[PDB]
Short mmCIF file of C-alpha atoms (C1' of nucleotides) and ligand atoms in Angstrom, two decimals:
data_model
loop_
_atom_site.label_atom_id
_atom_site.label_comp_id
_atom_site.label_asym_id
_atom_site.label_seq_id
_atom_site.Cartn_x
_atom_site.Cartn_y
_atom_site.Cartn_z
CA UNK A 1 -4.37 56.13 -19.00
CA UNK A 2 -6.44 53.42 -17.08
CA UNK A 3 -9.92 53.53 -18.63
CA UNK A 4 -13.44 54.58 -17.97
CA UNK A 5 -13.86 52.30 -14.90
CA UNK A 6 -10.84 54.13 -13.28
CA UNK A 7 -12.07 57.59 -14.28
CA UNK A 8 -15.36 56.89 -12.60
CA UNK A 9 -13.98 58.06 -9.23
CA UNK A 10 -13.25 61.42 -10.95
CA UNK A 11 -16.93 61.86 -11.95
CA UNK A 12 -18.92 65.05 -11.72
CA UNK A 13 -21.63 64.69 -9.04
CA UNK A 14 -25.24 65.69 -9.72
CA UNK A 15 -26.15 68.74 -7.75
CA UNK A 16 -29.85 69.57 -7.48
CA UNK A 17 -30.72 73.28 -8.28
CA UNK A 18 -34.44 72.67 -8.52
CA UNK A 19 -36.24 70.07 -6.49
CA UNK A 20 -37.26 67.11 -8.65
CA UNK A 21 -38.66 63.85 -7.12
CA UNK A 22 -36.34 63.05 -4.14
CA UNK A 23 -33.51 60.72 -4.84
CA UNK A 24 -33.85 58.36 -1.87
CA UNK A 25 -37.60 58.47 -1.48
CA UNK A 26 -40.56 60.52 -0.37
CA UNK A 27 -41.86 57.75 1.94
CA UNK A 28 -40.94 54.16 3.05
CA UNK A 29 -41.41 51.43 0.47
CA UNK A 30 -41.15 53.94 -2.56
CA UNK A 31 -37.65 53.32 -3.79
CA UNK A 32 -35.88 50.04 -2.75
CA UNK A 33 -32.59 48.72 -3.95
CA UNK A 34 -31.53 45.11 -4.77
CA UNK A 35 -27.83 44.32 -4.59
CA UNK A 36 -25.85 41.12 -4.35
CA UNK A 37 -22.35 40.54 -2.97
CA UNK A 38 -20.16 37.87 -1.55
CA UNK A 39 -19.28 38.08 2.14
CA UNK A 40 -15.66 38.18 2.90
CA UNK A 41 -15.63 35.21 5.28
CA UNK A 42 -14.69 31.64 4.69
CA UNK A 43 -17.56 29.25 5.85
CA UNK A 44 -17.20 25.73 7.07
CA UNK A 45 -19.76 22.83 6.67
CA UNK A 46 -21.89 21.80 9.56
CA UNK A 47 -21.46 18.18 9.08
CA UNK A 48 -18.16 17.22 7.45
CA UNK A 49 -16.11 20.49 8.24
CA UNK A 50 -14.58 21.21 4.85
CA UNK A 51 -14.16 24.54 3.28
CA UNK A 52 -17.34 25.59 1.59
CA UNK A 53 -15.99 28.93 0.16
CA UNK A 54 -17.33 32.23 0.63
CA UNK A 55 -21.15 32.83 0.71
CA UNK A 56 -23.35 35.36 -1.07
CA UNK A 57 -25.48 37.92 0.58
CA UNK A 58 -28.32 39.75 -1.12
CA UNK A 59 -29.83 42.92 0.25
CA UNK A 60 -33.14 44.61 -0.31
CA UNK A 61 -32.93 48.16 1.19
CA UNK A 62 -35.57 50.82 1.65
CA UNK A 63 -33.73 53.72 0.20
CA UNK A 64 -35.72 56.29 2.23
CA UNK A 65 -34.81 55.11 5.66
CA UNK A 66 -31.75 53.10 4.54
CA UNK A 67 -33.47 50.24 6.24
CA UNK A 68 -32.45 46.57 5.55
CA UNK A 69 -35.89 45.30 4.42
"C1'" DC B 1 22.91 109.92 53.85
"C1'" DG B 2 22.10 109.28 49.14
"C1'" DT B 3 22.93 106.60 45.10
"C1'" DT B 4 24.29 102.30 42.44
"C1'" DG B 5 25.07 97.68 41.43
"C1'" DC B 6 24.14 92.92 43.21
"C1'" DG B 7 21.57 89.13 44.85
"C1'" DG B 8 17.45 86.38 47.27
"C1'" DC B 9 12.12 85.44 46.79
"C1'" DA B 10 8.19 84.51 44.84
"C1'" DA B 11 4.66 85.08 41.42
"C1'" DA B 12 4.55 85.13 36.10
"C1'" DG B 13 5.85 83.62 31.79
"C1'" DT B 14 7.08 80.00 28.40
"C1'" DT B 15 7.29 74.80 26.78
"C1'" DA B 16 5.96 70.35 27.10
"C1'" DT B 17 2.86 66.15 27.84
"C1'" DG B 18 -0.90 63.27 28.36
"C1'" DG B 19 -6.29 63.83 28.57
"C1'" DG B 20 -11.34 65.20 26.37
"C1'" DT B 21 -14.45 66.69 22.78
"C1'" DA B 22 -16.76 68.14 18.41
"C1'" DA B 23 -15.53 68.31 13.40
"C1'" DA B 24 -12.95 68.06 9.28
"C1'" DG B 25 -11.17 64.30 6.57
"C1'" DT B 26 -10.64 59.23 4.63
"C1'" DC B 27 -11.69 55.66 2.26
"C1'" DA B 28 -14.48 51.03 0.68
"C1'" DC B 29 -19.28 49.46 -1.05
"C1'" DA B 30 -19.15 49.16 -5.80
"C1'" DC B 31 -18.71 39.93 -8.39
"C1'" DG B 32 -14.42 38.22 -7.03
"C1'" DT B 33 -8.55 36.03 -4.42
"C1'" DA B 34 -6.61 31.80 -3.95
"C1'" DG B 35 -4.53 29.15 -7.91
"C1'" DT B 36 -0.62 26.45 -10.46
"C1'" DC B 37 3.69 24.26 -12.06
"C1'" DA B 38 8.30 22.25 -10.26
"C1'" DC B 39 10.38 19.30 -7.34
"C1'" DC B 40 12.84 14.36 -5.93
"C1'" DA B 41 12.31 10.28 -2.76
"C1'" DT B 42 9.84 5.88 -1.85
"C1'" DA B 43 6.50 1.84 -2.71
"C1'" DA B 44 5.23 -1.29 -6.20
"C1'" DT B 45 4.41 -3.89 -9.69
"C1'" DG B 46 5.45 -6.26 -14.03
"C1'" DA B 47 8.99 -7.70 -16.98
"C1'" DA B 48 13.87 -9.27 -17.86
"C1'" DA B 49 16.78 -12.30 -16.23
"C1'" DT B 50 19.21 -15.25 -13.38
"C1'" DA B 51 22.53 -18.83 -11.92
"C1'" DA B 52 22.05 -22.81 -10.78
"C1'" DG B 53 19.77 -27.05 -11.23
"C1'" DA B 54 17.66 -31.09 -13.93
"C1'" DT B 55 17.51 -34.38 -17.15
"C1'" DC B 56 19.06 -36.79 -21.83
"C1'" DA B 57 22.44 -38.89 -24.44
"C1'" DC B 58 26.88 -40.94 -25.26
"C1'" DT B 59 31.62 -43.33 -23.87
"C1'" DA B 60 34.45 -45.86 -21.38
"C1'" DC B 61 35.84 -49.13 -17.29
"C1'" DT B 62 35.40 -52.87 -14.46
"C1'" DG B 63 32.79 -56.51 -11.06
"C1'" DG B 64 31.37 -60.99 -11.84
"C1'" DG B 65 27.48 -65.68 -12.02
"C1'" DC B 66 24.39 -69.34 -14.35
"C1'" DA B 67 23.05 -73.41 -17.11
"C1'" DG B 68 25.57 -77.40 -17.51
"C1'" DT B 69 29.33 -81.17 -16.65
"C1'" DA B 70 31.50 -84.85 -13.80
"C1'" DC B 71 33.26 -88.35 -10.45
"C1'" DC B 72 33.43 -91.30 -6.29
"C1'" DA B 73 31.65 -93.92 -3.75
"C1'" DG B 74 27.65 -95.16 0.53
"C1'" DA B 75 23.36 -97.08 1.22
"C1'" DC B 76 18.65 -98.91 0.63
"C1'" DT B 77 15.80 -102.10 -2.20
"C1'" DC B 78 14.87 -106.26 -4.47
"C1'" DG B 79 15.21 -110.08 -8.84
"C1'" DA B 80 16.73 -114.43 -8.59
"C1'" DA B 81 18.09 -118.23 -6.36
"C1'" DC B 82 19.47 -121.51 -1.98
"C1'" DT B 83 18.22 -124.02 1.61
"C1'" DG B 84 15.82 -125.78 6.03
"C1'" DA B 85 11.19 -127.08 8.75
"C1'" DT B 86 6.93 -129.09 8.13
"C1'" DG B 87 1.96 -131.16 7.66
MG1 MG C 101 -22.53 42.99 -5.94
MG1 MG C 102 -15.63 42.85 -1.84
#
DNA sequence: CGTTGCGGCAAAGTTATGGGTAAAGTCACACGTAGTCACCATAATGAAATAAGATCACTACTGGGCAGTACCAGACTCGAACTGATG
């Protein structure tokens, strides 16, 4: 009906019967994620005060402690 | 006198309403919302044009003066001659 990107919410999860390597990390600085986004905020210039559009934030996260590295 | 129905009194029973606390749900993070014709009045030239103005050329009408002519004396000047005083 809508496509694969819409059925992605109706996906079967992965449930661990046995214990493989842990998904989020055995220790800090083992698995760390990089991801970009654009912040939902309009920013103004510091000198001339025009609309500069929405900025972009990139995050590096330690997946074990979920810490924003 | 004893019994029976009726009514007051005060817990007791049932709903309702505004509080607190853990615990089942809920939903966005997944690159994204701003973006684009349609609209008719006003300035604003630049061109188109003006309506009158400017000058040429011709036609007719009407003031009107200059080089030259002419006479009638009055008046000053002077050839030519007359005539008187004189050394
Ligand atoms: Mg992203
Ligand atoms: Mg977003």
